[model samples]
Target: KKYIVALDQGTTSSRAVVMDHDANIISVSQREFEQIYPKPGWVEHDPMEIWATQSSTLVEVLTKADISSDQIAAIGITNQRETTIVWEKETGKPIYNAIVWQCRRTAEICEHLKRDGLEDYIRSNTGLVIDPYFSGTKVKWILDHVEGSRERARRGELLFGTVDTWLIWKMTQGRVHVTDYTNASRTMLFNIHTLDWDDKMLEVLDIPREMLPEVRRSSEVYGQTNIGGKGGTRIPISGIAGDQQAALFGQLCVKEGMAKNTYGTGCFMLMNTGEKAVKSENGLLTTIACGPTGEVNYALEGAVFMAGASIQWLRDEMKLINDAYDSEYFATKVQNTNGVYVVPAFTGLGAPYWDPYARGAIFGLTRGVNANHIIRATLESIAYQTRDVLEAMQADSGIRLHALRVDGGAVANNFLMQFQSDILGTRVERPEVREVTALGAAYLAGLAVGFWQNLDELQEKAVIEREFRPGIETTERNYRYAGWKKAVKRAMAWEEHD
Candidate 1:
């Protein structure tokens, strides 16, 4: 039987999974790469290393699954969105390192844009706030800093792409440079309503339109790639989506009012808005998604900049837990956080509170609080942040969700999942397959190549692992959330100085 391959290129790791006809992940391979930090709040990734790690995993997975290249029906790619890359068109070499979405180097640029009276226009047109979390400012910074780069890009000597477009160009050997709607939406240059790159934004950001990639549908075949060269088989690269959208699709949250939260390097909450692009009355992004029929769908999205990353900080910096899995064990050891609250605004606050100057803070910590209390407080912080976004989502769409679907590396933490349900007063459903991001991409690719007939056939493959129902009283939950709010207020604008 033929198999489908999915390339999941994330911020911290490059992973690939092989899926059979039944949507089961037969084998998987992963490689972690270096995360470059040039300065505080600045993050970068070597473009060549990303390409190398991703390609190696593809080969490794095929070997592990004992499958031939020709036996692979199609390939799908889902990647960290808004990580900007600009490469030389003639030499196919990156002009500079990939500017990651988490980088805050362009905060001043974002400020300048806001001061220029473009805030309302940008918000109304792009459905996004002016922040360094997007690609437009990152691309502008690259062009402005790299000597002679802007002229070269204007002359059609340079090309710009997010991670997906970069991978597609590498796999196709520079034959095709394209990006899907979901990725393009994160660029801050793409007009979600028009479904095209915005000329006004390009002009305001001074980005060359010639350097952009052709926008395509999320599930259509973009091009063919000969992965291993000379003897390699030509496989169709059928599906591409940003990681959150892919997870949303993989979880089958396609209908309007259905919502899902993914806890990865960051936490993202998205609710499907169906055909209508519901402009968020509150602070949420009206972004595009992959429709069930390979058409464009809209979603209201809220982003939490720090979720799993806060836990990583606990392991790597604070020396709190030996491993991420150990967090749950230690968290459960404590009856409660002992009146402690952790506001992990490590990379600033996202969503309703867009304060770039915010820094992490801990509150209500007494002499009685111990390591377990801190660990439990950190995990609970993720849930509180989810509620922050969920409150905004409900305000914007007026849809009170019955259940929230979830999938990610952090979702395996049972304590965190239960806390999320308890804090939000909503049911949390986790799938048996934890790798929904990769599965979503595989399903998209498989459907494009007829490996899967339709959405109905694919949706049937999803199986629930367990559901976490809310257990706490509303008063207690609100009191706990109130403490979190107070802690966040203390964290906001801590980095700002007159």
Candidate 2:
């Protein structure tokens, strides 16, 4: 009975899950970390804290499961994408705090790049827009701001990577400095079609090629962890991907036109496009998809930067509910949003809108508005944002979505899942395991190490938790969605005037 360990390093927390060969989760442990918000729109994470917290959770999981290092056949890693970190190559020490993907400090740099007429070139090559949500601008920011950083990078003394590369480096004792194609596609520097770093984009960003990590396929063995400290078990670290891509693979959306939406701290909707890289005419991004084998697959990705985070904010900041679970009970108490809409643009909106200047706003609030109505509106906002992304996805791919495989913490909320299904007018299938991000990575590592035979075996092990059918009236759905659209317009138009 072989087991695989999956390390999931996310924005708000780091988690480790141990799963058996049959895809049953044996033990799971998670540790939350502090989010450093330096300024109103700026977000940062201490690289040392990220490493410490993540590594500690790994130890906790193994100890709590009462499993020895020898029992684990392989290790997989799924991490937050686009969170930029740079460190010294020789000592593996971070140069500064990690610039989070949600940070808008690089917005000016992105704006400058767009004005320089590099938008079309970047879009054509990398299948991404020149936005701060990517890593290129953040990389450039670190090089320019950190003392003597550019000279060090030019001298091949520095290394730049997304969070996945950082974790791999730490896990392998600095022996492996690599990232997967899925994570590389988010850097605005790799061409998804050519499967290589774009020289033109690199030259524009002034990033030295030597500073970058070697990009590899999602399923191949990258290296082995040396930090376990128990006779240094050389368990192969085979699978690595960004969180959204990992969830896509975990859901086993291997066929073209199949799709999945992961509702975590944020929401991501991805559609498998097979080998074809269809550029988006809409505001969606075309990214690398994870395949069972080493073959490259393409996907259309739409992002909502805040989904579950909004509910947490209501609990933490607004004092609306003492716990996140209370949100579901409150939301279900009302049949509709009561004409209220919450556009959670706290850190700005993503996809279709792409408005970074917009702040969060609640609309249609009357004197009689209560906490339940607000909670319902907040939940409905997630469904509305998903519909926005799905509409753009359909526009770009020309393939109507049939059903969506759902996973993540929020999917446990049956009310939200049912509402999502109703709003999208599609079937929402929740897997037995909601932590598919980690599971996907484990599956990849297991397959690479021959612990699992093929995707067929993995799929056979996937059990369905529930299936949410579209049950809301179409006319009401349309009406509620229209209000959401209007609310978005108002949300976008409103600026924070201090």
Candidate 3:
């Protein structure tokens, strides 16, 4: 039987999954690459390394599954959004390392955009606020710093894309240079209203329009790739999406007001707003999502810059837990954080605050606060950030969600899930399939190639594995949340200087 292969390009790693028609993942392969920190608050990835690892996993997964290239129906790709990459057209050499979405090096450029008074125009037109987290500022930063790169771009010698576009280009041997609408919307250079790259934004950022990729639908056969070497059948590359949107679709939150929160390196809460693009005055972002039939639809998103990464800090940096899974046990060992609050603003706060200058901090620390208390506090911080985004999401969408579908590595942690429910006072759903992101991409690819007839056929397989309900008192939750807000305030603009 034919299967769909999903290439999941995340912030920390590249993975490939082979799935059958029943949505069962037959085999998987994953490889993590290095994360470059050229300076504090800066992050980069070798685009070549991304291609190598991603391409390697694609071939390795098929061999492990005992599936041939011809047996693959199509390929779907889901990647970390807004991680900017620029390369030469002739050599396919990246002019600079891929600027990670978490990099805050372009905070100055963002301030200039605000000073130029493009904030309102950008918000209304692009459905995004001026922030370095988006691709446009990162693109601008590369052109300005790379020396002769802007001139090359102006002369049509360069190309810019998010990670998906980069991968597709490599897969097709530079035959395709394109990105899906979901990935395009995160660039801050795309007009959500017009569904095209914004000329005003391009000119304002001094970015050459020729450097951009052609925008395509999320689930169309953009091109073909012979990833299995010579004499192998060319597989159609059909699906593409930003990681969060893929998770949203994978969770089957296709109806309006249906929402899901993914706990990856960061936490993103997205509510489907259907056809109507609901503007968010509450600091949520208006972005695009792939519909059940591959049509474009609007979504409201709240991004929290740090979630599971904070847990990683407790392991690698503080040496509190031996493993990420150990965090749940250690955290639950403490009844509370002992009045401590950890604001994980490492890459600055996201959504509702957008404070790019904010730095991470810990407050209410005392001799009484042990390692377990610190671990518990760090875990609680993720829930608090989710609540921060949910409040904004509810204000913008006007839909009260009965449950929040959660998928990702961190969702496996029962404590975090229950705490997430308690903090939001809403039920939390854990799907039977934790690999929803890859599955969503696979579903899109399968639909494009008719492996699955439609969403109805796929929706039948969605089953909730578990649920978490709010168990804590409202008074206690509110008091704890208030303490988090206070902690966040003290972290804001810690790097800002006259």
Candidate 4:
């Protein structure tokens, strides 16, 4: 039987999944590479290491699945969005390490954008808010910081792309340099209304228009890849999307008002708005949606800077637990946080607040706040942040969600999932296959090559293994969330100077 391969390049690692025609994940491989921190609040990843690990995992998955390259129908790729990379057009060497999406080195540049009165103009054209989380400022930072890089780009000696563009170009041996609307939207350079890179955006950022990659749909056949230079073998590489958009498609949240929230190192909440690009009066971002066959839809997206990473901090830094799952174990041990609250703004607040000067803080803690209380409080912080985003989205779109489809590694934590449901006052549904991000890429690729016929066929195959229903009344939920709001205030702008 023919199969599709998905390359899920993420914040922490590279993962590959081999799926048969039935869309079952038959074989999986993942490899985590190093994270480079040049200073406090600065995060970087070696682009070569990303290439190495991602390529290795792709080959390993094929071997483990006992499938030849020729047997693969097409390849789909989903990756961390807004992580900026620049490379030589001829040599494929990165001009610098990839500035991760979580990096704060470009916050000053974003503030400058805001101060220049270009915030509204940017939002109108790009459907994005001014923030370092997007790639526009990051690209501007790279050009100015990297010596002679701006000159090289001006002379058309260099190329710019988010991780998706970077991976596809390399996968095809420099045959294609393109990104999709979902990824291009995150760059804050593309005009979502016009479906092209905005000249005004390029002008304001002083970025070389020639350095940008051509934009494409999420699920078109960009090109082909000759795996390991296997003679005359060309596997069609057909799918591309930012990670969150892929998860939304994988969860089958196609109808307007349907929503999905992915809890990984960070939390992303996306609500499908159908074809209408509903402008957000709230802090939500309007972004392009993902469709396998080039269907253009719009979505409202919000970000929470910390989710699983908070759990990691307790393990690696605080030493409260030896593993990430241990945080869940400890969380369940406590009935509640014992009147404590932890606001994890390690990279600052996103959505609603959008305060980059924010810092992590804990409140309402006395001597009674022990390790268990602390862990529970930290876990609850994720739910509180989810509520913050959901409320804003509901206000923006006027579509109240009855349930939320969840995917990603953190959903495995029963405590977090149930708490999320309780706070949002909605049902939380977890799929049987939790790796929907990779599955999304697979679905996109499968559709491109006709392995799967349409959305209807895949919709029938979706299976939910677990669901969390709200256990508390709105009164109690609001009371607790009100306390969280107070705690959030203490965290905002805590770091006076970022």
C-alpha TM-score for every candidate: 0.98, 0.97, 0.98, 0.97
Per-residue CA lDDT of model 2 for 324-405, tens digit only, reads 8899999888876666779998887789878777778988878887889999888988889999999999999898868878
Q: Which stretches of model 2 miss by more than 4 angstroms? A: 228-232, 493-498
Worst 10 residues of 2 by lDDT: 489-498
How does model 1 fare in lDDT?
0.90
**Pairwise lDDT winner, candidates 2 and 4:** 4
Question: What's the residue-level lDDT of 381 in candidate 3?
Answer: 91
Which candidate model has the greater TM-score, 2 or 4? Answer: 4
Q: Candidate 4: lDDT of 65?
A: 69
Report model 1's TM-score to 2 decimal places.
0.98
lDDT of each: 0.90, 0.87, 0.90, 0.88
Query: Residue by residue across 173-249, what tens digits does model 4's lDDT show?
Result: 88889899899999988899999989999999999998999888788888988885447778888888889999999
- Candidates 2 and 3, the one with greater lDDT: 3
- The predicted structure with the larger TM-score, 2 or 3, is 3
Global fold similarity of model 4 (TM-score) = 0.97
Taking the candidates one at a time, how many backbone clashes does each contain? 0, 0, 0, 0
Q: Over all chains combined, what TM-score does candidate 2 have?
A: 0.97
Model 3 residue runs over 4 Å out of place are 229-232
> Highest TM-score: which candidate?
3
Q: Candidate 1, after superposition: displacement of residue 6 in Å?
A: 0.6
Residues 161-253 of candidate 1 have per-residue lDDT tens digits of 999999999998999999999999999998999999899999999998999999998888898988664385688999999999999998888
Superior candidate under TM-score, 1 versus 2: 1
